[PDB]
Design a protein around this motif. Structure first.
Motif, PDB file in Angstrom:
ATOM      1  N   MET B  67       0.842  -1.190   0.000  1.00  0.00           N
ATOM      2  CA  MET B  67       0.000   0.000   0.000  1.00  0.00           C
ATOM      3  C   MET B  67       0.881   1.245   0.000  1.00  0.00           C
ATOM      4  O   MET B  67       1.800   1.375   0.816  1.00  0.00           O
ATOM      5  N   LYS B  68       0.595   2.148  -0.937  1.00  0.00           N
ATOM      6  CA  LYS B  68       1.457   3.276  -1.256  1.00  0.00           C
ATOM      7  C   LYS B  68       1.378   4.352  -0.183  1.00  0.00           C
ATOM      8  O   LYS B  68       0.321   4.573   0.416  1.00  0.00           O
ATOM      9  N   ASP B  71      -1.468   6.422  -0.966  1.00  0.00           N
ATOM     10  CA  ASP B  71      -2.807   5.842  -0.935  1.00  0.00           C
ATOM     11  C   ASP B  71      -3.348   5.665   0.476  1.00  0.00           C
ATOM     12  O   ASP B  71      -4.570   5.688   0.661  1.00  0.00           O
ATOM     13  N   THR B  79      -8.463   2.212   4.196  1.00  0.00           N
ATOM     14  CA  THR B  79      -7.245   2.059   3.414  1.00  0.00           C
ATOM     15  C   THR B  79      -7.137   0.649   2.868  1.00  0.00           C
ATOM     16  O   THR B  79      -6.946   0.446   1.666  1.00  0.00           O
ATOM     17  N   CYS B  80      -7.265  -0.341   3.747  1.00  0.00           N
ATOM     18  CA  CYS B  80      -7.100  -1.724   3.342  1.00  0.00           C
ATOM     19  C   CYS B  80      -8.287  -2.192   2.513  1.00  0.00           C
ATOM     20  O   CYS B  80      -8.116  -2.975   1.572  1.00  0.00           O
ATOM     21  N   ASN B  82      -9.769  -0.441   0.353  1.00  0.00           N
ATOM     22  CA  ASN B  82      -9.403  -0.061  -1.006  1.00  0.00           C
ATOM     23  C   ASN B  82      -8.255  -0.908  -1.546  1.00  0.00           C
ATOM     24  O   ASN B  82      -8.325  -1.412  -2.674  1.00  0.00           O
ATOM     25  N   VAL B  83      -7.168  -1.019  -0.781  1.00  0.00           N
ATOM     26  CA  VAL B  83      -5.943  -1.627  -1.290  1.00  0.00           C
ATOM     27  C   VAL B  83      -6.196  -3.061  -1.744  1.00  0.00           C
ATOM     28  O   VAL B  83      -5.693  -3.493  -2.788  1.00  0.00           O
ATOM     29  N   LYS B  86      -7.696  -3.112  -4.991  1.00  0.00           N
ATOM     30  CA  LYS B  86      -6.637  -2.913  -5.976  1.00  0.00           C
ATOM     31  C   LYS B  86      -5.959  -4.236  -6.301  1.00  0.00           C
ATOM     32  O   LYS B  86      -5.771  -4.583  -7.472  1.00  0.00           O
TER      33      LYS B  86
END
Ligand SMILES: Nc1ncnc2c1ncn2[C@@H]1O[C@H](COP(=O)(O)OP(=O)(O)O)[C@@H](O)[C@H]1O
Lengths: 203, 144, 139, 72
Positions: B67-68, B71, B79-80, B82-83, B86
């Motif tokens: 995870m950037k 991001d 966050t997670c 979304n990640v 991805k």
């Protein structure tokens, strides 16, 4: 679908129920070329797939359901490495505690560890029979509902010694001025009247 | 009647070897024991469902490399959430609970694979820069 | 490469000729590419070298003219930052952990390379500001 | 709190009425076990708003009925 050069798989063997194997040639959607122990020669005939193996960082975890690939090879491997290499005899599967007879004595049952487990939740700690006794003692407070710890296994698996330690836990954390002496002194009576030499084992 | 009035907690005991050898293990007996204890069925049944259940913060603690730094959000749960979308296109491999991410079997090993390959690409970058510095240093010393 | 670049690079190359034949070893080709501002991996270096065998890597010598196509092929900001940010989240990186991973993963380096590059870059806690260290190490 | 020390599921090169009783008791105990696990995971899914239909359990009532029911 993942199978590549440098993948690993488990293969059956009459000597040990599974062998580890290195996948030596990439899979193409019909027979697999494998490297092994003891040098390498196999081509392995799929039938109208081999069990596929967890990355080494996972293996040895405290909980067999925490593995990424679940199958009889993975389970047998985790229990084998934890028992032989790490000398850990207690393991979890789901809710079930799994206990393996070390079959020589160990320090592990000391009163210091008894105190270390008190109040801990079952996932907070590495598995131990005291973690089950402690969860029972917790649940009996959280609800008045009574609690049963069911110890089961083949003869000689250590069911009696596991009950012994499970009671020693309650008697240390709760107990006060005695049950322990009388219950443990009952065992030679109940073993005399109720145990027999079976074909596969004594007692 | 005695047990159904109660709540059970289970201990299964297995015997490693028939010969009483201390602290050695036989595959062929142990597998028989682990089938007789119903452990293998419990494991298979869990494998059919969603075996692996990660708290979002543990998922972050594992896959921060994935995870950037851009991001990551002001909450790691989203966050997670979304990640992982991805990283794995189809949600059906996973579920989002209130407290845990649920995964089908194997998806964690996949995430660890891609995580480790990305970590080695980062190590390649940093090592290549340091090693190239030493090469430059000795090269310019020879020119010096 | 223009004539000026080719002349400076050839002069340096000849400075590295330890046999007098106007040549360097294959194993020096990567060193020359890196000294000229390129950052190729060892894999990339072996690839442009043609994945040489041990014997020719240690004893076969090539002149500037054979090196040149390889240098050209090798020659042709956010990634460097993220590569260091992998090990970040206060903007620091452990010296012990960076040393271990660089010496044990990937194209493992020696402890002396890491000590040399890390010298003066770690603070009192033993933490390295990697953005400053990165800008410094890329020049 | 009650602690139960009971022999496990048994299989021998020869099996006789004693083994048949032991294995029937272990059928009952593992029916209880499978129901408890099934309950626990329905309740976890209600903590997590996930559909129940995904989960199923091994039902060994047909073997208990084979041993225990009338004309068993
Ligand atoms: N956890 C353990 N630590 C040390 N020794 C053990 C343990 N479990 C079993 N043993 C040894 O194995 C023997 C057989 O197990 P036991 O529990 O006595 O038989 P059963 O389980 O059939 O009642 C014990 O007498 C003891 O000598």
């Amino acid at each position: 679908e993942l199978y590549t050069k440098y993948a690993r798989v488990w293969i059956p063997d009459p000597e040990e129920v599974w062998k580890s194997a290195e996948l030596l040639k990439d899979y193409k959607p019909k027979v697999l070329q494998l490297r092994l122990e003891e040098g390498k020669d196999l081509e392995y005939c799929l039938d109208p797939l081999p069990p596929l193996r967890n990355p080494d960082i996972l293996v040895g975890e405290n909980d067999l359901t925490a593995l990424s690939y679940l199958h009889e090879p993975a389970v047998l491997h985790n229990l084998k490495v934890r028992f032989i290499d790490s000398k850990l005899i207690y393991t979890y599967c789901g809710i079930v505690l799994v206990a393996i007879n070390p079959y020589e004595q160990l320090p592990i049952y000391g009163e210091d560890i008894i105190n270390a487990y008190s109040g801990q939740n079952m996932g907070d700690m590495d598995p131990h029979i005291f973690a089950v006794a402690e969860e029972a003692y917790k649940q009996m407070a959280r609800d008045e509902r009574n609690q049963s710890i069911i110890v089961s296994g083949e003869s000689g698996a250590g069911k009696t010694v596991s009950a012994k330690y499970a009671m020693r836990y309650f008697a240390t954390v709760s107990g006060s001025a005695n049950v322990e002496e009388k219950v443990l002194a009952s065992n030679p009576i109940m073993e005399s009247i109720g145990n027999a030499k079976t074909t596969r084992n004594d007692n | 009647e005695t047990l159904n009035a109660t709540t059970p907690h289970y201990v299964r005991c297995i015997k490693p070897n028939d010969f009483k050898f201390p602290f050695t293990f036989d595959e062929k007996r142990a597998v028989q024991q682990l089938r007789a204890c119903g452990v293998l069925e419990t494991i298979r049944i869990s494998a059919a469902g969603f075996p692996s259940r990660w708290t979002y913060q543990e998922f972050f603690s594992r896959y921060r490399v994935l995870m950037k730094q851009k991001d990551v959000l002001s909450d790691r749960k989203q966050t997670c959430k979304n990640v992982l979308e991805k990283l794995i296109l189809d949600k059906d491999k996973y579920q989002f609970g209130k407290t845990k991410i649920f995964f089908r079997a194997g998806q964690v090993a996949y995430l660890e694979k891609i995580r480790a390959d990305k970590l080695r690409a980062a190590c390649i970058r940093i090592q290549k820069t340091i090693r190239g510095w030493l090469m430059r240093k000795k090269y310019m010393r020879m020119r010096r | 490469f223009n004539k000026d670049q080719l002349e400076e690079f050839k002069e340096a190359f000849e400075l590295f000729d330890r046999v007098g034949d106007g040549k360097i070893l294959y194993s020096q080709c990567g060193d020359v590419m890196r000294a000229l501002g390129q950052n190729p991996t060892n894999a990339e270096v072996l690839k442009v070298l043609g994945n040489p065998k041990s014997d020719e890597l240690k004893s076969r010598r090539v002149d500037f003219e054979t090196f040149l196509p390889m240098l050209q092929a090798v020659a042709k900001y956010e990634d460097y930052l993220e590569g260091f940010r992998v090990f970040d989240g206060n903007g620091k990186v452990m010296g012990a952990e960076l040393r271990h991973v660089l010496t044990t993963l990937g194209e493992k380096m020696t402890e002396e390379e890491v000590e040399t590059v890390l010298a003066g870059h770690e603070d009192s806690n033993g933490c390295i500001n990697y953005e400053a260290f990165l800008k410094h190490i890329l020049s | 709190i009650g602690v139960l020390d009971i022999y496990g599921f048994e299989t021998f090169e020869i099996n006789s009425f004693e083994q048949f009783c032991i294995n029937y008791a272990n059928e009952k105990l593992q029916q209880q076990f499978n129901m408890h696990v099934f309950k626990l995971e329905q309740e976890e899914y209600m903590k997590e708003q996930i559909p129940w239909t995904l989960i199923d359990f091994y039902d060994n009532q047909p073997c208990i009925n084979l041993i225990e029911a009338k004309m068993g």
